Assembly symmetry: C3
Homo-oligomer: 307 residues x 3
């Protein structure tokens, strides 16, 4: 698709990970993914203008071009390479097909991963999760991948669903679903069939949310986060909202518990501006919540350990 | 009132609870109640279009007519009796007494036909007519009410809860989530020996640490939307900050214990007071639809076991 | 400033704390402060129309003029002297300067304090914290003051920020920051340099929010509350909102744990009506939340003890 040309050309023009990064985690590359959502996708822009300091005492540094200098130990910097929006607006009114989104996402991820970057995708409908971990499995066939999936619903009963395809193709070592509260009968079958591990809302709430210290894991983890996992009071901008969800803080805490050798990638999606609750200054509530989730997600790619 | 005619005619035309329903809990009958709220009452419709799967792995099935087949499968049949007020049957607004007679009659019909009545919308007055209908049919049964609200709502002698307490139809009352308790409220509390669980007390104790609400008598569940924090359910008159999250309420509801459910009333929601998304979906509608669904699940699974 | 004349006229005409107040805590005086915020400031009016019963079975009684009768032992009344808005909305179109707001606040606070009242300021940008603590320090130089500061940010990296000024002038015995989740490197330096005690969001959440029983203290405490300490879902009406904050109930609980002999003053600020989320009937969500926080704040000024 010609809609992704300017973006994709800039991606494979990216300077590779320097030698000064050897044995260090990162760096992180960030791009905007808009499949299945309205053409106007403000989430990436909103995040880039958000404050850089995190919960844990570190600070994002954003760069539109390389080379990405590896920061010294004493400097709590976390470099992010902004690759901008995948879809170049005003390159036509054409809407990229699902397959075109997949190919565009697959290539960008392949390119970023090959150059030593941890890819973080922002926006869209979750299909980026499929193309991103397949790009990783292509480059690193021997690595075992486990996905930590935050979602109000399992979203695996449909054979065309991104997570279902990954399980069907046998590309996944394991899946940990977090926050489900709308589980269908078919969802339960796919659960038992693919031996999925799950932590539903009602269960983790009654055990105590802050009593979750970690999600133990030895394999490289992909972090897939549907905004629907949050309660509509925090993230209203989702199709078919499910009340009784995680607070933004709840989500941040569980994210911080993720354990593993490295982060293979991050997908933050499910956000639709047409569905958001807006302040009087026309700032959307869900964009506020996700901008924070994206930030602390990036911090995770830099600080994650097996224990 | 002629505004309820179409509805009431359908309710007493409802096929009675089959013999398959055995010694089982249920089934459930659902109707929309609009007393004290604007004519446009979208909560029932919004609930009907919501997904059917619950927190606990069961599934609502909605039916518009009998017979209600007793499921062998984790199905939970709900009989939709629709709105009580028939729109475009006149521009008239039913009086308080008309709303009372209508709900009383409907509840009486549904109850003795074996259904557990669930009322959605209105201002809480349905609680009065529903347990009075139960007490009329089951004079020997003792009734205890679990009442979720930001206010005790017993200072007014005309209150639905106060009338039931004054007529001595209630064995006991458990108030949950009160955070605006008046001096007059406290006097009525001690006089009727009401058990209460105020927000500040429940919170510092640990919300999730609430395992049970122990009880041996048939429970009525009365839920005012105002029990929830305005961040989750803003569509209430005189909102009180510092309330329950929707999840908090769902967890406390799940801890309710008892032999059976006499009825459920979900009210306090006014569409004119809601926070709306850009697509004009109301935040309070979202929260309440879930609470109704998990409330129905309670009528099917409640037990005396702690 | 002629904008504050009518207000100040009424304030220094206030009848002093009667002999009945004995050695009782209170009474409380309440005024509207609007520095750094839009001219229209509706928070005070919204509080005055709110229910007067508290969480802890006491009742606010609002009075527009003295003398403030001290209620009997068995009567759970908590008298509040409403001094109204500082800025008179019909004395001209002039916008008071920062210095004029400071001087006006300093004079009002001084006047109320020496008349035996505990001053509670509502609205503005947080600059009232500076002028009120200085007003108290002017009158009682021997008293040691500790501030309990609820905020999403440390807000001490800027040499002009109220909390930094107070620390630089050495008017503070100690500072307890609560709920910070956007801490900069500059913030960390000021923290260590001034021995500031802090309780950041991620920390207090993982340790158990309800498990916070008290904030032990022996010195008179000033309570400074930035609305931004609350999650945007509860208090959206803040400049540069930070997701993952406190629920209103979280804040109420932490406030209740605050210990001390007396309250030197209370400042509730950070609220901007232009940034609020509104119900269809045009009631702002942040106003609902803050109205409650103000009420339970007044309750603390009547019930605080070192135990």
């Amino acid at each position: 698709s010609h809609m992704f040309s300017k973006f994709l050309m800039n991606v494979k023009g990216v300077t590779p990970r320097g030698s000064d990064w050897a044995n260090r985690l990162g760096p992180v590359a960030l791009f905007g993914y808009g499949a299945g959502m309205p053409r106007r996708a403000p989430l990436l822009d909103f995040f880039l203008q958000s404050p850089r300091d995190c919960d844990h005492y570190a600070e994002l540094t954003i760069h539109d071009k390389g080379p990405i200098e590896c920061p010294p130990e004493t400097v709590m910097f976390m470099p992010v390479l902004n690759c901008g929006q995948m879809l170049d607006e005003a390159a036509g009114t054409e809407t990229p097909t699902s397959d075109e989104w997949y190919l565009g996402s697959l290539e960008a991820s392949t390119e970023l991963l090959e150059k030593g970057y941890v890819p973080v995708s922002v926006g869209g409908d979750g299909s980026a999760t499929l193309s991103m971990v397949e790009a990783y499995k292509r480059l690193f066939p021997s690595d075992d991948i486990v996905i930590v999936h935050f979602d109000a619903r399992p979203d695996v009963s449909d054979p065309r669903s991104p997570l279902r395809v990954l399980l069907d193709k046998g590309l996944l070592k394991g899946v940990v679903s977090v926050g489900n509260r709308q589980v269908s009968s078919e969802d339960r079958k796919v659960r038992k069939l693919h031996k999925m591990f799950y932590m539903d809302m009602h269960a983790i709430y009654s055990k105590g949310l802050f009593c979750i210290r970690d999600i133990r894991n030895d394999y490289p983890v992909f972090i897939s986060i549907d905004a629907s996992v949050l309660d509509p009071a925090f993230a209203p901008a989702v199709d078919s909202p499910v009340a009784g969800g995680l607070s933004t803080r709840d989500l941040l805490h569980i994210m911080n518990g993720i354990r593993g050798p490295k982060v293979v990638g991050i997908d933050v999606y499910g956000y639709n501006p047409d569905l958001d609750v807006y302040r009087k200054d026309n700032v959307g509530l869900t964009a506020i919540a996700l901008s924070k989730i994206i930030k602390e997600g990036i911090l995770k790619a830099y600080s994650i350990s097996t224990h």
